[PDB]
Design a protein around this ligand. Structure first.
Ligand SMILES: CC(C)Cc1ccc([C@H](C)C(=O)O)cc1
Length: 133
């Protein structure tokens, strides 16, 4: 049911995002900007290439990848990371590694909503998204 992730998703709730960003070394001025927008995330597929786009006023980003194939990514906060996206049951797991550390960005569909859990050590952030019509 990978296809249930496809489409356009809008942020409707957040918890611990500011704490998560602080845990990655994102400065207060940038955290303030990042938190005061409700981003849109577009997930699309073309053959075996997936694309994830994030649109806001903090930044626009786009990554393209194949499931299970490591890729280079430069995150919204300017980390150069080694990334991989996998499917673990119903969880779409985006792992970012750099400099001996890591963070996961996990997406799961619960009751039709897309729950994005961001984990960096003990910092855990929940970002709740609703599908656009
Ligand atoms: C450190 C931070 C700026 C990286 C980051 C983490 C999550 C998201 C998602 C799409 C969101 O804002 O929900 C965007 C960018």
């Amino acid at each position: 049911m990978v296809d249930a992730f496809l489409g356009t998703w809008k942020l409707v709730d957040s918890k611990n995002f500011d704490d998560y960003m602080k845990s990655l070394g994102v400065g207060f001025a940038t955290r303030q900007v990042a938190s005061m927008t409700k981003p849109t995330t577009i997930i699309e597929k073309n053959g075996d290439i997936l694309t994830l786009k994030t649109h806001s006023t903090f930044k626009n980003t786009e990554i393209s990848f194949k499931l299970g194939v490591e890729f280079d990514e430069t995150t919204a906060d300017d980390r150069k990371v080694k990334s991989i996206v996998t499917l673990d049951g119903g969880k779409l797991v985006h792992l970012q590694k750099w400099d001996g550390q890591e963070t996961t960005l996990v997406r799961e569909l619960i009751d039709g909503k897309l729950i994005l859990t961001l984990t960096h050590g003990t910092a855990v952030c929940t970002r709740t998204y609703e599908k656009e019509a």
